[PDB]
Coordinates of all heavy atoms in Angstrom, one line a residue:
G1 N -63.6 -67.4 -5.3 CA -64.9 -67.9 -5.4 C -65.6 -68.1 -4.1 O -65.0 -67.8 -3.0
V2 N -66.8 -68.6 -4.1 CA -67.5 -68.9 -2.8 C -68.0 -70.3 -2.9 O -68.6 -70.8 -3.9 CB -68.6 -67.9 -2.5 CG1 -69.6 -67.8 -3.5 CG2 -69.1 -68.2 -1.1
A3 N -67.9 -71.0 -1.7 CA -68.5 -72.4 -1.6 C -69.3 -72.3 -0.3 O -69.0 -71.5 0.6 CB -67.4 -73.4 -1.4
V4 N -70.4 -73.1 -0.2 CA -71.3 -73.1 0.9 C -71.5 -74.4 1.5 O -71.6 -75.4 0.9 CB -72.7 -72.5 0.4 CG1 -73.3 -73.4 -0.7 CG2 -73.7 -72.4 1.6
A5 N -71.6 -74.4 2.9 CA -71.9 -75.6 3.6 C -73.0 -75.4 4.6 O -73.2 -74.4 5.1 CB -70.6 -76.0 4.4
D6 N -73.7 -76.5 4.9 CA -74.8 -76.5 5.9 C -74.1 -76.6 7.3 O -74.8 -76.1 8.3 CB -75.8 -77.7 5.7 CG -76.7 -77.5 4.6 OD1 -76.8 -76.4 4.1 OD2 -77.4 -78.4 4.3
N7 N -73.0 -77.1 7.4 CA -72.3 -77.3 8.6 C -70.9 -76.7 8.6 O -70.2 -76.9 7.5 CB -72.3 -78.7 9.0 CG -73.7 -79.2 9.3 OD1 -74.4 -78.8 10.2 ND2 -74.1 -80.2 8.5
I8 N -70.4 -76.2 9.6 CA -69.1 -75.4 9.6 C -67.9 -76.3 9.2 O -67.0 -75.8 8.6 CB -68.8 -74.8 11.0 CG1 -67.5 -74.0 11.0 CG2 -68.7 -75.9 12.1 CD1 -67.7 -72.7 10.2
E9 N -68.0 -77.6 9.5 CA -66.9 -78.5 9.2 C -67.1 -79.2 7.8 O -66.4 -80.1 7.5 CB -66.6 -79.6 10.3 CG -66.1 -78.9 11.6 CD -65.7 -79.9 12.6 OE1 -65.3 -81.1 12.3 OE2 -65.7 -79.5 13.8
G10 N -68.0 -78.6 7.0 CA -68.3 -79.1 5.7 C -69.3 -80.2 5.5 O -69.9 -80.6 6.5
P11 N -69.4 -80.7 4.3 CA -68.7 -80.3 3.1 C -69.1 -79.0 2.5 O -70.3 -78.7 2.5 CB -69.0 -81.5 2.2 CG -70.3 -82.0 2.6 CD -70.3 -81.9 4.1
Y12 N -68.2 -78.3 1.9 CA -68.5 -77.0 1.2 C -68.6 -77.3 -0.3 O -67.8 -78.0 -0.9 CB -67.4 -76.0 1.5 CG -67.4 -75.4 2.9 CD1 -66.9 -76.2 3.9 CD2 -67.9 -74.2 3.1 CE1 -66.9 -75.7 5.2 CE2 -67.9 -73.7 4.4 CZ -67.4 -74.4 5.4 OH -67.4 -73.9 6.7
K13 N -69.7 -76.8 -0.8 CA -70.0 -77.0 -2.2 C -69.8 -75.7 -3.1 O -70.3 -74.6 -2.7 CB -71.5 -77.4 -2.3 CG -71.7 -78.8 -1.7 CD -73.2 -79.1 -1.6 CE -73.4 -80.6 -1.4 NZ -72.6 -81.1 -0.3
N14 N -69.1 -75.8 -4.1 CA -68.7 -74.7 -5.0 C -69.9 -74.0 -5.6 O -70.8 -74.7 -6.2 CB -67.7 -75.2 -6.0 CG -67.2 -74.0 -6.9 OD1 -67.1 -72.8 -6.4 ND2 -66.9 -74.3 -8.1
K15 N -70.0 -72.7 -5.5 CA -71.0 -71.9 -6.2 C -70.4 -71.1 -7.4 O -71.1 -70.6 -8.2 CB -71.6 -70.9 -5.2 CG -72.4 -71.5 -4.1 CD -73.2 -70.5 -3.3 CE -74.3 -69.9 -4.1 NZ -75.1 -68.8 -3.3
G16 N -69.1 -71.1 -7.5 CA -68.4 -70.5 -8.6 C -67.4 -69.4 -8.2 O -67.5 -68.8 -7.2
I17 N -66.5 -69.1 -9.2 CA -65.6 -68.0 -9.2 C -66.3 -66.7 -9.4 O -67.2 -66.7 -10.3 CB -64.5 -68.2 -10.2 CG1 -63.7 -69.4 -9.9 CG2 -63.6 -67.0 -10.4 CD1 -62.7 -69.8 -11.0
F18 N -66.0 -65.6 -8.7 CA -66.6 -64.3 -9.0 C -65.6 -63.2 -9.2 O -65.9 -62.1 -9.5 CB -67.6 -64.0 -7.9 CG -67.1 -63.8 -6.5 CD1 -66.5 -62.6 -6.2 CD2 -67.1 -64.8 -5.6 CE1 -66.0 -62.4 -4.9 CE2 -66.6 -64.6 -4.3 CZ -66.0 -63.4 -4.0
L19 N -64.3 -63.4 -8.9 CA -63.2 -62.4 -9.2 C -62.0 -63.2 -9.8 O -61.7 -64.2 -9.3 CB -62.8 -61.7 -7.9 CG -63.7 -60.5 -7.4 CD1 -63.1 -60.0 -6.1 CD2 -63.9 -59.4 -8.5
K20 N -61.3 -62.5 -10.7 CA -60.0 -62.9 -11.2 C -59.1 -61.7 -11.3 O -59.5 -60.6 -11.5 CB -60.1 -63.6 -12.6 CG -60.7 -65.0 -12.6 CD -60.8 -65.6 -14.0 CE -61.3 -67.0 -14.0 NZ -61.7 -67.4 -15.4
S21 N -57.8 -62.0 -11.1 CA -56.7 -61.1 -11.3 C -55.6 -61.8 -12.2 O -55.6 -63.0 -12.3 CB -56.2 -60.5 -10.0 OG -55.8 -61.5 -9.1
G22 N -54.7 -61.0 -12.8 CA -53.6 -61.5 -13.5 C -53.9 -62.0 -14.9 O -53.1 -62.7 -15.5
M23 N -55.1 -61.7 -15.4 CA -55.4 -61.9 -16.8 C -54.6 -61.0 -17.7 O -54.1 -60.0 -17.2 CB -56.9 -61.6 -17.1 CG -57.4 -60.2 -16.8 SD -57.8 -59.9 -15.1 CE -59.4 -60.7 -15.0
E24 N -54.5 -61.4 -18.9 CA -53.7 -60.6 -19.9 C -54.4 -59.4 -20.4 O -53.8 -58.4 -20.9 CB -53.2 -61.5 -21.1 CG -52.5 -60.9 -22.2 CD -51.0 -60.6 -21.7 OE1 -50.7 -60.5 -20.5 OE2 -50.1 -60.5 -22.7
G25 N -55.8 -59.4 -20.4 CA -56.6 -58.4 -21.0 C -57.5 -57.7 -20.0 O -57.1 -57.3 -18.9
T26 N -58.8 -57.6 -20.4 CA -59.8 -56.9 -19.7 C -60.0 -57.5 -18.3 O -60.2 -58.7 -18.1 CB -61.1 -56.9 -20.4 OG1 -61.0 -56.4 -21.7 CG2 -62.2 -56.1 -19.6
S27 N -60.0 -56.6 -17.3 CA -60.0 -57.0 -15.9 C -61.5 -57.0 -15.4 O -62.4 -56.7 -16.2 CB -59.2 -56.1 -15.0 OG -60.0 -54.9 -14.7
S28 N -61.7 -57.3 -14.1 CA -63.0 -57.4 -13.5 C -63.7 -56.0 -13.5 O -64.9 -55.9 -13.4 CB -63.0 -57.9 -12.1 OG -62.5 -59.2 -12.1
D29 N -62.9 -54.9 -13.7 CA -63.5 -53.6 -13.7 C -63.7 -53.0 -15.1 O -64.0 -51.8 -15.3 CB -62.8 -52.6 -12.8 CG -61.5 -52.0 -13.4 OD1 -61.1 -52.4 -14.5 OD2 -60.8 -51.2 -12.7
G30 N -63.5 -53.8 -16.1 CA -63.7 -53.4 -17.5 C -62.5 -52.7 -18.2 O -62.6 -52.4 -19.3
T31 N -61.4 -52.5 -17.4 CA -60.2 -51.9 -17.9 C -59.1 -53.0 -17.9 O -59.2 -53.9 -17.2 CB -59.8 -50.7 -17.1 OG1 -59.3 -51.1 -15.9 CG2 -60.9 -49.7 -16.9

């Protein structure tokens, strides 16, 4: 995922997950 901060030493705020692996079914590429 990605998190964003105004300053390099934080705090970083979560924007969300955007990739997963190791699922049992459909992957991020649709297969």
Side-chain angles (χ1 to χ4, degrees):
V2 62
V4 60
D6 284 349
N7 297 297
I8 186 70
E9 294 186 26
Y12 290 77
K13 294 166 162 55
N14 183 30
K15 296 188 68 180
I17 294 170
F18 66 84
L19 282 176
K20 283 176 176 168
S21 53
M23 61 277 285
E24 178 75 337
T26 304
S27 83
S28 302
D29 81 357
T31 72

